[PDB]
Amino acid sequence: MATLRRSVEVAAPAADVWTLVGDFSAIHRWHPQVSAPTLRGASPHTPGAERVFGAGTEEELVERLVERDESARRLVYTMPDPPFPITNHRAVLEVVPRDDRHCTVVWTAMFDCSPETARELESVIGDGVFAVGLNALAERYGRLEHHHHHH
């Protein structure tokens, strides 16, 4: 699949999780693989702002906010400078409330990649970057209802 979708069980209300994931610039508050991103113009809540991971190294990542929904808990961005061989990138952050104390945080990433590379990116981007970040977030809200296996 060129379209990736992952979901995690968080022991907390969805709105509290949107206060964490939503910011775009402030992803280094929960996501351990984020080596501090540099937020360029527009403001991080306004559809347009870019975030440059590292910003002084041989391996950086430049992302850009396409559109943002505060009340809907829906965060859409793209990679205008991606290190992975793709054409058009598109990714969304949707925190879906199941109960008042339980919310499923769904991270989606779809990109126009070639099949032999795309199967590899499902494990690297999906079962690597997301399966670490989403799960570490579920562990820090585990102060309400129990910890789980890291990643």
TrEMBL record:
<dbReference type="InterPro" id="IPR019587">
    <property type="entry name" value="Polyketide_cyclase/dehydratase"/>
</dbReference>
<protein>
    <recommendedName>
        <fullName>SRPBCC family protein</fullName>
    </recommendedName>
</protein>
<dbReference type="InterPro" id="IPR023393">
    <property type="entry name" value="START-like_dom_sf"/>
</dbReference>
<dbReference type="Pfam" id="PF10604">
    <property type="entry name" value="Polyketide_cyc2"/>
</dbReference>
